Amino acid sequence: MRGSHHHHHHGSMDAQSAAKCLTAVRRHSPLVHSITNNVVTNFTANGLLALGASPVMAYAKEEVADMAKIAGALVLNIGTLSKESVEAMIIAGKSANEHGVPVILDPVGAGATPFRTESARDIIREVRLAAIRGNAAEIAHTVGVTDWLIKGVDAGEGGGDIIRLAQQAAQKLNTVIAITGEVDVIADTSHVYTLHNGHKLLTKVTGAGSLLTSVVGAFCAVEENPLFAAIAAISSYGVAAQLAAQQTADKGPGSFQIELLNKLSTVTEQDVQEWATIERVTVS
Amino acid sequence: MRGSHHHHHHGSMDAQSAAKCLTAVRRHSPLVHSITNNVVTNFTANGLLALGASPVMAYAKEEVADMAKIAGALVLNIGTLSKESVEAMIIAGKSANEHGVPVILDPVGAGATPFRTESARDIIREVRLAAIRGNAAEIAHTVGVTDWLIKGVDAGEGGGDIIRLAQQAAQKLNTVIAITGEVDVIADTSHVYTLHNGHKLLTKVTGAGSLLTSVVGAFCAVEENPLFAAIAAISSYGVAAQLAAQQTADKGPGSFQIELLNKLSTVTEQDVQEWATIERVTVS
Amino acid sequence: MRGSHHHHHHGSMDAQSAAKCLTAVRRHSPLVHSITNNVVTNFTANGLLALGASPVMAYAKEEVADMAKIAGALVLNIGTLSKESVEAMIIAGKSANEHGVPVILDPVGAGATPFRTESARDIIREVRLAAIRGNAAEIAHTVGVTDWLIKGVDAGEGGGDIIRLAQQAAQKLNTVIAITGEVDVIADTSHVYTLHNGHKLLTKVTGAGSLLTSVVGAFCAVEENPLFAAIAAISSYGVAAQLAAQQTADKGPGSFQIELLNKLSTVTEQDVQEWATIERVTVS
């Protein structure tokens, strides 16, 4: 079910191709194996079911390998990691690698504590990843940026040096790096894009971020190029979030949480075509 | 406490008797000890609270034996299982048996992987069960396939094959077998019933089946005959789902999830009497 | 960030001062580290996010010390514990203690089973607590090493004996004791208050109590006087629950769960001033 829905030889990734990927997810209901934190497991599964994917949440070493093996994508999230779950994630990642299943990493809290930073780095050393998604700090810490340089994230900033961090990190780890923010910056070794969808209410719902990473997994299962897959996923998810906000921006974060799930099921190819904002960043 | 809301010497189980069991559940607020997967613990607990029961989710070896012995019913779900949790489920199950607390099993995943099938079998070997609720495949592979034939040209269920599977499984394991699906077939060693309630939206909410098994548990806690208890529980849950689907309309799976919780609390004896579709299967 | 919004000498805690504490919480978005169970993690995090605080869940012994020391408050919940998590809670508590991070304990289930009771006692023995939030029974069973330790009179419901219960516990443990119920009783070594807000629907939402305890943590992070912090936290939460129940009307606990999240976000400083019912108990 992993086809090719866009190529740079036909132009830059756009809203049209993004909408096509969304259709593919619905059509194939890809199995997405998520080994995520226990604060967002339920929401992750429901978000994927709403979208149209098939969530599988096995996490024990007694079954992760055989499950990742037959999944369309594997998503690892270290939100409430333990020595045991990090080992299970790596066992799962190695099985996925052996069977050509794309693996996505969400380094939640990388940099907050040493254990998280080192676990993220252990996963990257032992597992070939198709994409990594996190905020600027988590990515910086995960890829090994020097301590004192990290400061270049605080204060008011959301466009510029983040573009370089994303491409440079993608080149060092030969993967796709998605740096989350109001404006998302995504890049692989040779290409960079900025994404402008979503709504601030997402910051008031736990798992909103974790769900997106798993959503990226759903798209990588149906689109061969993870850069295109991730752009289509983030765009579709953001459009759904905007439509959800429209109907529940005044009710509150509780209603929005529910509305996000509603919209992931009702968002259409036409909505993505009309609202997705994807911009190619010139790199030369 | 426990009681008898119906007897076969007293006609076939019906909507009226089902409605009475529902009232009994709310009147007694039975302690339902559910050991389930981390993807549905919250939804399971909320569903039970909405219904009118008192959930307890202890899962650790250090306390499951103590919690199970004072509960009205013990429910075991094998999702996202591990060697560790299976052992705890057995300790809990034996404690429940020693104190006359009914145990209900949900063999989710049985037949899909060896660890699940063996774990389900391990529980059956060590714990006496009041009922087992799962889909056709999970029940067939758990019990072991002895009858293969069903119907030529794959299309649907059949019209008697699932009915045979249930009664034979019930006779082999000497328990109540509830095969769930768009038709629900419940049977014990000498009686079989088909249930026709519910709504497709349930497939879009994680923990749907998980919760249903626990609801069966709540009903087993107040009705002596597990066959009647399961019928009443499944009928009540299904009617609530139908009402929730009607209120939800086209809002989406998020709204339906919240509505199912709402309806598990607002569904009345009258709604059950009016909408529960229970049919006793004639077996000459 | 533990500042003072009410200097104790100008008068007792009131609805006006409690309201200002709420604004302080939203102004600082305190990092609340919660070590709790998967049945209530998601609601606890979403509730804190709605309120205006920043939730972080970390349980691994490899990182709890590091996470607790940078948190604004540490909250320990023994809900569905394991020998492993209790070990981690104590490690985190000791770290918090060495760095002046307030620690709040929710002794859920203490007394209902042996392991839970003992685990509650080990924590209090090894960790200095800023406050303990539980019901009359849990508080009694947790402080009552002997069956005579707690003196007074036994009867239905309770409150006065509850007042003496709270003072005895506060002085014995040298902390703030928050005994929740229809009417809340809160006391430290010198003062006692009764709070009259909230709604019965809270008993129909799993994680309602767990969330309240973590909310107390959020207020303790910004208000230096733990007694005042607990009062402001419980009052804000209760008022939000009242507005939520009104908004819900008679839809059901599903809608209430969502509306409670909405209101924790939309409840204003003015709402607390108007609805908060705080009464200083005259101790002669």
PDB file of C-alpha atoms in Angstrom, chain B residues 83-263:
ATOM      1  CA  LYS B  83       4.152 -12.287  31.038  1.00  0.00           C
ATOM      2  CA  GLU B  84       3.988 -10.110  34.151  1.00  0.00           C
ATOM      3  CA  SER B  85       0.341  -9.089  33.788  1.00  0.00           C
ATOM      4  CA  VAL B  86      -0.829 -12.577  32.812  1.00  0.00           C
ATOM      5  CA  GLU B  87       0.645 -13.883  36.060  1.00  0.00           C
ATOM      6  CA  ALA B  88      -1.180 -11.171  38.014  1.00  0.00           C
ATOM      7  CA  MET B  89      -4.432 -11.937  36.213  1.00  0.00           C
ATOM      8  CA  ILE B  90      -4.122 -15.563  37.321  1.00  0.00           C
ATOM      9  CA  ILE B  91      -3.377 -14.602  40.940  1.00  0.00           C
ATOM     10  CA  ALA B  92      -6.434 -12.352  40.799  1.00  0.00           C
ATOM     11  CA  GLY B  93      -8.537 -15.060  39.145  1.00  0.00           C
ATOM     12  CA  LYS B  94      -7.669 -17.713  41.714  1.00  0.00           C
ATOM     13  CA  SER B  95      -8.465 -15.284  44.524  1.00  0.00           C
ATOM     14  CA  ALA B  96     -11.797 -14.528  42.865  1.00  0.00           C
ATOM     15  CA  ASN B  97     -12.568 -18.248  42.543  1.00  0.00           C
ATOM     16  CA  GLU B  98     -11.760 -18.957  46.187  1.00  0.00           C
ATOM     17  CA  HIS B  99     -14.288 -16.309  47.242  1.00  0.00           C
ATOM     18  CA  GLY B 100     -17.057 -16.980  44.740  1.00  0.00           C
ATOM     19  CA  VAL B 101     -16.450 -13.804  42.739  1.00  0.00           C
ATOM     20  CA  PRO B 102     -17.425 -14.365  39.079  1.00  0.00           C
ATOM     21  CA  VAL B 103     -14.565 -13.974  36.601  1.00  0.00           C
ATOM     22  CA  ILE B 104     -15.116 -12.823  33.029  1.00  0.00           C
ATOM     23  CA  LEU B 105     -12.425 -13.130  30.347  1.00  0.00           C
ATOM     24  CA  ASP B 106     -11.864 -11.105  27.178  1.00  0.00           C
ATOM     25  CA  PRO B 107      -9.375 -13.109  25.035  1.00  0.00           C
ATOM     26  CA  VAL B 108      -8.644 -10.193  22.738  1.00  0.00           C
ATOM     27  CA  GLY B 109      -6.108 -11.158  20.100  1.00  0.00           C
ATOM     28  CA  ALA B 110      -6.350 -14.907  20.710  1.00  0.00           C
ATOM     29  CA  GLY B 111      -5.592 -16.765  17.488  1.00  0.00           C
ATOM     30  CA  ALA B 112      -3.755 -13.778  16.004  1.00  0.00           C
ATOM     31  CA  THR B 113      -0.454 -14.544  17.762  1.00  0.00           C
ATOM     32  CA  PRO B 114       0.773 -17.538  19.795  1.00  0.00           C
ATOM     33  CA  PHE B 115       1.414 -15.563  23.009  1.00  0.00           C
ATOM     34  CA  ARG B 116      -2.182 -14.319  23.102  1.00  0.00           C
ATOM     35  CA  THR B 117      -3.691 -17.744  22.413  1.00  0.00           C
ATOM     36  CA  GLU B 118      -1.464 -19.412  25.035  1.00  0.00           C
ATOM     37  CA  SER B 119      -2.114 -16.673  27.590  1.00  0.00           C
ATOM     38  CA  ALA B 120      -5.867 -17.016  27.125  1.00  0.00           C
ATOM     39  CA  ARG B 121      -5.482 -20.781  27.510  1.00  0.00           C
ATOM     40  CA  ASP B 122      -3.268 -20.321  30.589  1.00  0.00           C
ATOM     41  CA  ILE B 123      -6.020 -18.308  32.284  1.00  0.00           C
ATOM     42  CA  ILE B 124      -8.671 -20.875  31.374  1.00  0.00           C
ATOM     43  CA  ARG B 125      -6.447 -23.639  32.756  1.00  0.00           C
ATOM     44  CA  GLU B 126      -5.950 -21.934  36.142  1.00  0.00           C
ATOM     45  CA  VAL B 127      -9.157 -19.938  36.639  1.00  0.00           C
ATOM     46  CA  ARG B 128     -12.819 -21.000  36.632  1.00  0.00           C
ATOM     47  CA  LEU B 129     -14.701 -18.529  34.419  1.00  0.00           C
ATOM     48  CA  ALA B 130     -18.305 -17.328  34.571  1.00  0.00           C
ATOM     49  CA  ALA B 131     -18.132 -16.136  30.968  1.00  0.00           C
ATOM     50  CA  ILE B 132     -15.838 -15.473  28.034  1.00  0.00           C
ATOM     51  CA  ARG B 133     -16.548 -12.668  25.578  1.00  0.00           C
ATOM     52  CA  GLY B 134     -14.719 -12.308  22.257  1.00  0.00           C
ATOM     53  CA  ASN B 135     -15.270 -12.441  18.502  1.00  0.00           C
ATOM     54  CA  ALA B 136     -15.740 -15.698  16.596  1.00  0.00           C
ATOM     55  CA  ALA B 137     -12.047 -16.090  15.753  1.00  0.00           C
ATOM     56  CA  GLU B 138     -10.815 -15.473  19.294  1.00  0.00           C
ATOM     57  CA  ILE B 139     -13.236 -18.023  20.714  1.00  0.00           C
ATOM     58  CA  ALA B 140     -12.636 -20.677  18.024  1.00  0.00           C
ATOM     59  CA  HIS B 141      -8.849 -20.557  18.248  1.00  0.00           C
ATOM     60  CA  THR B 142      -8.838 -20.300  22.029  1.00  0.00           C
ATOM     61  CA  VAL B 143     -11.005 -23.394  22.399  1.00  0.00           C
ATOM     62  CA  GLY B 144      -9.374 -25.134  19.435  1.00  0.00           C
ATOM     63  CA  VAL B 145     -10.865 -25.815  15.997  1.00  0.00           C
ATOM     64  CA  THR B 146     -12.813 -29.083  15.878  1.00  0.00           C
ATOM     65  CA  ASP B 147     -15.605 -28.082  13.472  1.00  0.00           C
ATOM     66  CA  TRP B 148     -14.318 -26.542  10.245  1.00  0.00           C
ATOM     67  CA  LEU B 149     -17.236 -26.408   7.797  1.00  0.00           C
ATOM     68  CA  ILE B 150     -19.600 -23.434   7.854  1.00  0.00           C
ATOM     69  CA  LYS B 151     -20.681 -22.270   4.398  1.00  0.00           C
ATOM     70  CA  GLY B 152     -19.314 -22.073   0.870  1.00  0.00           C
ATOM     71  CA  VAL B 153     -18.295 -18.790  -0.750  1.00  0.00           C
ATOM     72  CA  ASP B 154     -17.076 -16.375   1.925  1.00  0.00           C
ATOM     73  CA  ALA B 155     -19.588 -13.565   2.437  1.00  0.00           C
ATOM     74  CA  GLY B 156     -20.856 -13.210   5.991  1.00  0.00           C
ATOM     75  CA  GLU B 157     -21.472 -15.264   9.124  1.00  0.00           C
ATOM     76  CA  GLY B 158     -23.744 -18.024   7.862  1.00  0.00           C
ATOM     77  CA  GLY B 159     -26.876 -18.760   9.851  1.00  0.00           C
ATOM     78  CA  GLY B 160     -25.953 -21.516  12.269  1.00  0.00           C
ATOM     79  CA  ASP B 161     -22.179 -21.949  12.260  1.00  0.00           C
ATOM     80  CA  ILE B 162     -21.520 -19.321  14.937  1.00  0.00           C
ATOM     81  CA  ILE B 163     -24.407 -20.769  16.933  1.00  0.00           C
ATOM     82  CA  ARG B 164     -22.720 -24.199  16.863  1.00  0.00           C
ATOM     83  CA  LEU B 165     -19.338 -22.726  17.789  1.00  0.00           C
ATOM     84  CA  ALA B 166     -20.755 -20.974  20.851  1.00  0.00           C
ATOM     85  CA  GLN B 167     -22.636 -23.953  22.277  1.00  0.00           C
ATOM     86  CA  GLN B 168     -19.718 -26.334  21.689  1.00  0.00           C
ATOM     87  CA  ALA B 169     -17.222 -23.913  23.214  1.00  0.00           C
ATOM     88  CA  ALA B 170     -19.562 -23.487  26.179  1.00  0.00           C
ATOM     89  CA  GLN B 171     -19.833 -27.250  26.642  1.00  0.00           C
ATOM     90  CA  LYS B 172     -16.081 -27.830  26.396  1.00  0.00           C
ATOM     91  CA  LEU B 173     -15.132 -25.054  28.835  1.00  0.00           C
ATOM     92  CA  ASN B 174     -18.294 -25.380  30.942  1.00  0.00           C
ATOM     93  CA  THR B 175     -18.895 -21.639  30.871  1.00  0.00           C
ATOM     94  CA  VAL B 176     -20.980 -18.976  29.149  1.00  0.00           C
ATOM     95  CA  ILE B 177     -19.774 -17.987  25.688  1.00  0.00           C
ATOM     96  CA  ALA B 178     -20.590 -14.577  24.272  1.00  0.00           C
ATOM     97  CA  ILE B 179     -19.480 -14.211  20.653  1.00  0.00           C
ATOM     98  CA  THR B 180     -19.740 -10.537  19.786  1.00  0.00           C
ATOM     99  CA  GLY B 181     -20.374  -9.014  16.395  1.00  0.00           C
ATOM    100  CA  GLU B 182     -23.146  -7.404  14.375  1.00  0.00           C
ATOM    101  CA  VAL B 183     -25.335 -10.241  15.699  1.00  0.00           C
ATOM    102  CA  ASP B 184     -24.031 -11.329  19.147  1.00  0.00           C
ATOM    103  CA  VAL B 185     -24.491 -15.006  19.971  1.00  0.00           C
ATOM    104  CA  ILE B 186     -24.626 -15.995  23.641  1.00  0.00           C
ATOM    105  CA  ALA B 187     -24.818 -19.550  24.916  1.00  0.00           C
ATOM    106  CA  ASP B 188     -24.210 -21.841  27.850  1.00  0.00           C
ATOM    107  CA  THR B 189     -24.173 -25.652  27.822  1.00  0.00           C
ATOM    108  CA  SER B 190     -27.859 -26.015  26.916  1.00  0.00           C
ATOM    109  CA  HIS B 191     -29.188 -22.630  25.770  1.00  0.00           C
ATOM    110  CA  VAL B 192     -28.335 -20.201  22.956  1.00  0.00           C
ATOM    111  CA  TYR B 193     -29.562 -16.667  22.218  1.00  0.00           C
ATOM    112  CA  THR B 194     -28.954 -14.145  19.432  1.00  0.00           C
ATOM    113  CA  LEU B 195     -28.803 -10.425  20.314  1.00  0.00           C
ATOM    114  CA  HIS B 196     -29.465  -7.653  17.803  1.00  0.00           C
ATOM    115  CA  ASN B 197     -28.505  -4.278  19.273  1.00  0.00           C
ATOM    116  CA  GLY B 198     -25.711  -1.741  19.032  1.00  0.00           C
ATOM    117  CA  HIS B 199     -24.300   0.543  16.344  1.00  0.00           C
ATOM    118  CA  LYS B 200     -21.315   0.623  13.962  1.00  0.00           C
ATOM    119  CA  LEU B 201     -19.856   3.759  15.566  1.00  0.00           C
ATOM    120  CA  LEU B 202     -18.656   1.526  18.405  1.00  0.00           C
ATOM    121  CA  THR B 203     -15.889   0.364  16.039  1.00  0.00           C
ATOM    122  CA  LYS B 204     -14.498   3.910  15.956  1.00  0.00           C
ATOM    123  CA  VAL B 205     -13.985   4.186  19.720  1.00  0.00           C
ATOM    124  CA  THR B 206     -11.111   2.284  21.327  1.00  0.00           C
ATOM    125  CA  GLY B 207     -12.118   0.327  24.414  1.00  0.00           C
ATOM    126  CA  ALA B 208     -15.591  -0.367  23.057  1.00  0.00           C
ATOM    127  CA  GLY B 209     -15.384  -4.137  23.374  1.00  0.00           C
ATOM    128  CA  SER B 210     -13.064  -3.780  26.322  1.00  0.00           C
ATOM    129  CA  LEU B 211     -15.795  -1.832  28.171  1.00  0.00           C
ATOM    130  CA  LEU B 212     -18.540  -4.233  27.078  1.00  0.00           C
ATOM    131  CA  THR B 213     -16.785  -7.160  28.763  1.00  0.00           C
ATOM    132  CA  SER B 214     -16.531  -5.146  31.979  1.00  0.00           C
ATOM    133  CA  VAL B 215     -20.231  -4.273  31.732  1.00  0.00           C
ATOM    134  CA  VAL B 216     -20.937  -7.996  31.441  1.00  0.00           C
ATOM    135  CA  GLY B 217     -18.935  -8.223  34.656  1.00  0.00           C
ATOM    136  CA  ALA B 218     -21.058  -5.572  36.365  1.00  0.00           C
ATOM    137  CA  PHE B 219     -24.192  -7.538  35.429  1.00  0.00           C
ATOM    138  CA  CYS B 220     -22.693 -10.869  36.522  1.00  0.00           C
ATOM    139  CA  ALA B 221     -22.175  -9.223  39.900  1.00  0.00           C
ATOM    140  CA  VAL B 222     -25.919  -8.829  40.465  1.00  0.00           C
ATOM    141  CA  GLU B 223     -27.443 -11.699  38.459  1.00  0.00           C
ATOM    142  CA  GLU B 224     -26.763 -15.307  39.499  1.00  0.00           C
ATOM    143  CA  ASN B 225     -27.118 -16.800  36.015  1.00  0.00           C
ATOM    144  CA  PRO B 226     -24.186 -15.563  33.900  1.00  0.00           C
ATOM    145  CA  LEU B 227     -26.076 -16.378  30.687  1.00  0.00           C
ATOM    146  CA  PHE B 228     -28.875 -14.019  31.693  1.00  0.00           C
ATOM    147  CA  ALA B 229     -26.341 -11.542  33.088  1.00  0.00           C
ATOM    148  CA  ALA B 230     -24.447 -11.432  29.775  1.00  0.00           C
ATOM    149  CA  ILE B 231     -27.631 -11.077  27.733  1.00  0.00           C
ATOM    150  CA  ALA B 232     -28.861  -8.206  29.890  1.00  0.00           C
ATOM    151  CA  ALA B 233     -25.467  -6.492  29.864  1.00  0.00           C
ATOM    152  CA  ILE B 234     -25.011  -6.731  26.097  1.00  0.00           C
ATOM    153  CA  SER B 235     -28.594  -5.658  25.422  1.00  0.00           C
ATOM    154  CA  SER B 236     -28.341  -2.675  27.789  1.00  0.00           C
ATOM    155  CA  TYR B 237     -24.993  -1.576  26.333  1.00  0.00           C
ATOM    156  CA  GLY B 238     -26.296  -1.955  22.776  1.00  0.00           C
ATOM    157  CA  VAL B 239     -29.450   0.051  23.429  1.00  0.00           C
ATOM    158  CA  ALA B 240     -27.321   2.797  25.005  1.00  0.00           C
ATOM    159  CA  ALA B 241     -25.062   2.750  21.941  1.00  0.00           C
ATOM    160  CA  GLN B 242     -28.058   3.121  19.614  1.00  0.00           C
ATOM    161  CA  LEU B 243     -29.336   6.129  21.585  1.00  0.00           C
ATOM    162  CA  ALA B 244     -25.855   7.640  21.593  1.00  0.00           C
ATOM    163  CA  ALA B 245     -25.542   7.164  17.821  1.00  0.00           C
ATOM    164  CA  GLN B 246     -28.884   8.882  17.267  1.00  0.00           C
ATOM    165  CA  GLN B 247     -27.932  11.918  19.353  1.00  0.00           C
ATOM    166  CA  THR B 248     -24.444  12.052  17.808  1.00  0.00           C
ATOM    167  CA  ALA B 249     -25.803  11.858  14.269  1.00  0.00           C
ATOM    168  CA  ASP B 250     -23.002  12.951  11.927  1.00  0.00           C
ATOM    169  CA  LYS B 251     -20.914  14.876  14.460  1.00  0.00           C
ATOM    170  CA  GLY B 252     -18.207  12.216  14.495  1.00  0.00           C
ATOM    171  CA  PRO B 253     -16.489   9.456  16.535  1.00  0.00           C
ATOM    172  CA  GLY B 254     -15.333  11.914  19.171  1.00  0.00           C
ATOM    173  CA  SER B 255     -18.861  13.057  19.946  1.00  0.00           C
ATOM    174  CA  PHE B 256     -20.076   9.452  19.866  1.00  0.00           C
ATOM    175  CA  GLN B 257     -17.523   8.410  22.498  1.00  0.00           C
ATOM    176  CA  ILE B 258     -18.836  11.050  24.902  1.00  0.00           C
ATOM    177  CA  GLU B 259     -22.439  10.189  24.039  1.00  0.00           C
ATOM    178  CA  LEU B 260     -21.918   6.496  24.792  1.00  0.00           C
ATOM    179  CA  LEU B 261     -20.777   7.476  28.289  1.00  0.00           C
ATOM    180  CA  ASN B 262     -23.761   9.817  28.580  1.00  0.00           C
ATOM    181  CA  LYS B 263     -26.247   7.139  27.496  1.00  0.00           C
TER     182      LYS B 263
END
